[PDB]
Amino acid sequence: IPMLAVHFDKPGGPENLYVKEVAKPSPGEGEVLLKVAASALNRADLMQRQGQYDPPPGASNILGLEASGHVAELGPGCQGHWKIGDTAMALLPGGGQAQYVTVPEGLLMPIPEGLTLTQAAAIPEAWLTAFQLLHLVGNVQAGDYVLIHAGLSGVGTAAIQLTRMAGAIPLVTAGSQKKLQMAEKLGAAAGFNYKKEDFSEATLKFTKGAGVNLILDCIGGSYWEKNVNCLALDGRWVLYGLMGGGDINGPLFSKLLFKRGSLITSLLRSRDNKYKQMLVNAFTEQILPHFSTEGPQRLLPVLDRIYPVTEIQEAHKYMEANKNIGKIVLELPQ
Amino acid sequence: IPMLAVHFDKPGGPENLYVKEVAKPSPGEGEVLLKVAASALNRADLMQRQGQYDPPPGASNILGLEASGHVAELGPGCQGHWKIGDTAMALLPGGGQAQYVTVPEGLLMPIPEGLTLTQAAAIPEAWLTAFQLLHLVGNVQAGDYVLIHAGLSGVGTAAIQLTRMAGAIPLVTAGSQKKLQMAEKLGAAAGFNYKKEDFSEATLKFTKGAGVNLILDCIGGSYWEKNVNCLALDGRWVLYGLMGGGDINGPLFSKLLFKRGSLITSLLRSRDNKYKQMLVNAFTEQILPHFSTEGPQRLLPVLDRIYPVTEIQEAHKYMEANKNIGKIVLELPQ
Numbered sequence: 001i002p003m004l005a006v007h008f009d010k011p012g013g014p015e016n017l018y019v020k021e022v023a024k025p026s027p028g029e030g031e032v033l034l035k036v037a038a039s040a041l042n043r044a045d046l047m048q049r050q051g052q053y054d055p056p057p058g059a060s061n062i063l064g065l066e067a068s069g070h071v072a073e074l075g076p077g078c079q080g081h082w083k084i085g086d087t088a089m090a091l092l093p094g095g096g097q098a099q100y101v102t103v104p105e106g107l108l109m110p111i112p113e114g115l116t117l118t119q120a121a122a123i124p125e126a127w128l129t130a131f132q133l134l135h136l137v138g139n140v141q142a143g144d145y146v147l148i149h150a151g152l153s154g155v156g157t158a159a160i161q162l163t164r165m166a167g168a169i170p171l172v173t174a175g176s177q178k179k180l181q182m183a184e185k186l187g188a189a190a191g192f193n194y195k196k197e198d199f200s201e202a203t204l205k206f207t208k209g210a211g212v213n214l215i216l217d218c219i220g221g222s223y224w225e226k227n228v229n230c231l232a233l234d235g236r237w238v239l240y241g242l243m244g245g246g247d248i249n250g251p252l253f254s255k256l257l258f259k260r261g262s263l264i265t266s267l268l269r270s271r272d273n274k275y276k277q278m279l280v281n282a283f284t285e286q287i288l289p290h291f292s293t294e295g296p297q298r299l300l301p302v303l304d305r306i307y308p309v310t311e312i313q314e315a316h317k318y319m320e321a322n323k324n325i326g327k328i329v330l331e332l333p334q
Numbered sequence: 335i336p337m338l339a340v341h342f343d344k345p346g347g348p349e350n351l352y353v354k355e356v357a358k359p360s361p362g363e364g365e366v367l368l369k370v371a372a373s374a375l376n377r378a379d380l381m382q383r384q385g386q387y388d389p390p391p392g393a394s395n396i397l398g399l400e401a402s403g404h405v406a407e408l409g410p411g412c413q414g415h416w417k418i419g420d421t422a423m424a425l426l427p428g429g430g431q432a433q434y435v436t437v438p439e440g441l442l443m444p445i446p447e448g449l450t451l452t453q454a455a456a457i458p459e460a461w462l463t464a465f466q467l468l469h470l471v472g473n474v475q476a477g478d479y480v481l482i483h484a485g486l487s488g489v490g491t492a493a494i495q496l497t498r499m500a501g502a503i504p505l506v507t508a509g510s511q512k513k514l515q516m517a518e519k520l521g522a523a524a525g526f527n528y529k530k531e532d533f534s535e536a537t538l539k540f541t542k543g544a545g546v547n548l549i550l551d552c553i554g555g556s557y558w559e560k561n562v563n564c565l566a567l568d569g570r571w572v573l574y575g576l577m578g579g580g581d582i583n584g585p586l587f588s589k590l591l592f593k594r595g596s597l598i599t600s601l602l603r604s605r606d607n608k609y610k611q612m613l614v615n616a617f618t619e620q621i622l623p624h625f626s627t628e629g630p631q632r633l634l635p636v637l638d639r640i641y642p643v644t645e646i647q648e649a650h651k652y653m654e655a656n657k658n659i660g661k662i663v664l665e666l667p668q
């Protein structure tokens with residue numbers, strides 16, 4: 001039986017995209033079908049339709065790493081915890097931007113109270129990655145200085161708040177004064193405009209010459225020279241981007257050895273199910289309750305713009321021009 | 335109050351080395367004076383007299399990173415398990431290749447029963463580093479596939495054995511068939527001659543395409559591509575040498591991020607006393623007793639050649655020619 005979903009015949013630019021009737025999936029041993037209300041764009045969706053990000057073997061080849069909606073159907077061998085009608089959000093390897101999606105019941109998360117389904121669609125990928133990067137990969141401690149690159153993005157806007165909730169001191173880099181000001185309102189200790197100034201020196205000045213203890217790098221090759229200088233002794237330098245590189249050309253080994261540094265790379269989409277549940281399980285204890293605490297310390301999902309699925313084309317152009325300040329959510333017709 | 339010591343007037347070649355009368359040092363709060371019976375050459379010593387390596391602020395600017403001998407004298411504030419006349423060995427920041435050396439008693443280790451003071455002179459720097467890199471930095475687990483570059487070096491010949499004791503599988507790379515054969519007898523699961531073959535394709539072949547879980551890289555630049563290729567998913571890549579480079583010139587970030595890798599750099603000499611005391615204590619408990627167990631599983635310190643201090647000049651030409659197969663010990667006239 002049929003189903004509307006985001007699609008592209010051939011890999012190319014954003015103009016190739018359209019909504020198409022594809023086959024409606026079905027559950028299968030410990031998973032549930034989710035009637036999607038709204039999904040969210042991520043940078044991985046851009047690369048995929050250009051061809052540079054194929055989904056892991058078996059996972060659906062259709063854009064959407066996260067989704068929010070209602071429980072449509074139960075699969076064989078479930079817990080019975082989730083029931084048909086319950087609201088939920090999930091982390092996906094694909095198939096997020098389609099009316100229905102098949103989701104293992106482990107990776108399914110409840111919606112915080114006082115949040116719209118459109119709002120809850122902005123949580124999964126951005127905050128689960130942020131939480132992974134900060135706590136599991138980085139082991140952020142109370143006192144650590146943190147350098148968040150592309151801080152006014154999906155993951156970055158989440159990272160500023162989790163770093164503040166972890167009791168660390170976040171430092172941001174972005175390409176606009178308008179963005180840095182929003183970064184400040186998210187509890188950023190300092191914000192630097194990389195197009196205006198050298199963030200390495202700014203960071204060394206802010207940390208009184210000590211440097212940062214943790215770097216959440218998602219730029220890569222254009223930043224490596226600068227990242228190593230402002231990295232403190234024994235500092236962790238978490239890599240997960242390559243938006244501004246992938247290639248290295250210089251004495252990285254020499255300088256990273258001098259700072260006694262550690263270059264820990266990290267991925268999420270490519271992980272196994274045992275790992276993904278463990279992350280979602282850790283996240284639902286440590287982080288999820290604070291989306292509906294009250295105000296003073298309440299985590300706010302940053303929404304820039306909401307588009308319908310029929311304007312998926314115009315949404316990709318908006319992300320590629322770097323205009324978004326937080327998440328950019330798509331609504332699927334129900 | 336004079337004392338014979340290895341010295342060089344200006345930084346240059348090995349011909350600048352000779353033995354000179356220097357002022358004899360004195361203890362000072364929680365340390366002892368060790369009457370040196372033997373020391374050992376390390377790669378650090380070569381770089382130091384070329385000018386590249388400097389000793390850490392305060393520490394003595396006289397060659398020798400390790401020593402073995404009798405506790406000549408007690409300094410103030412000693413805890414007093416050690417007594418004058420006790421034979422011991424020590425990890426130093428410098429001053430090891432001279433008749434007397436000042437040593438904090440926290441870094442003082444007992445000599446295994448049966449071993450000559452000359453043999454004990456090979457243990458500290460090589461094995462403490464090997465142990466550091468394997469356990470503390472690298473977190474070796476039983477079953478892991480460990481790739482040890484320059485495996486027939488001071489650090490190497492120790493690493494092979496500790497890796498084996500850890501229940502791990504050591505794979506070695508050296509530049510000579512004669513050397514590889516010695517690696518085998520030390521328990522190397524496989525040996526590769528890099529001057530004859532590609533170790534990246536050999537390593538993968540051995541690991542059934544899976545790749546190595548841990549790398550003890552002390553070559554650096556010239557090996558970076560071949561290391562990233564043969565590294566496994568979530569593999570650790572400990573960097574501690576840069577003998578064959580220091581510069582990178584390709585898509586390192588792209589490939590490391592695919593393997594979800596960790597590039598952990600490590601140094602020993604530059605560290606504070608707290609870390610050094612913690613490390614030597616872990617070593618004495620876990621490792622040291624096995625230097626005198628019985629036979630089957632016994633740890634063997636490997637000595638290539640012994641030189642007297644007067645022939646220091648000759649010893650440096652030997653190491654710089656890469657001829658040594660294990661440690662290379664210097665004996666001091668007492």
Ligand SMILES: NC(=O)c1ccc[n+]([C@@H]2O[C@H](COP(=O)([O-])OP(=O)(O)OC[C@H]3O[C@@H](n4cnc5c(N)ncnc54)[C@H](OP(=O)(O)O)[C@@H]3O)[C@@H](O)[C@H]2O)c1
Nearest residue numbers: 042043150153154155174175218240241244266267268322
């Ligand atoms: N590790 C994982 O499993 C995983 C999962 C999710 C996301 N990610 C990564 O997280 C990053 C952000 O993802 P997202 O979905 O949040 O994207 P996003 O919302 O579109 O944000 C990306 C931002 O980065 C900045 N930027 C783009 N190119 C840059 C460059 N060359 N140099 C410096 N800044 C640049 C842009 O703003 P300004 O330049 O104006 O500051 C842009 O707004 C991506 O690199 C993505 O690959 C990784």
Ligand SMILES: NC(=O)c1ccc[n+]([C@@H]2O[C@H](COP(=O)([O-])OP(=O)(O)OC[C@H]3O[C@@H](n4cnc5c(N)ncnc54)[C@H](OP(=O)(O)O)[C@@H]3O)[C@@H](O)[C@H]2O)c1
Nearest residue numbers: 376377484487488489508509575577578600601602603656
């Ligand atoms: N983290 C620390 O504080 C620390 C502590 C101790 C040692 N280290 C490092 O460990 C390394 C070895 O120390 P060591 O004193 O044991 O050295 P060593 O005994 O003199 O042996 C070095 C061996 O490495 C091989 N080699 C030399 N140059 C090479 C190159 N360009 N490419 C590939 N192989 C090369 C040579 O054998 P083949 O060519 O035959 O293979 C040589 O015999 C040094 O780089 C040193 O800096 C670091």
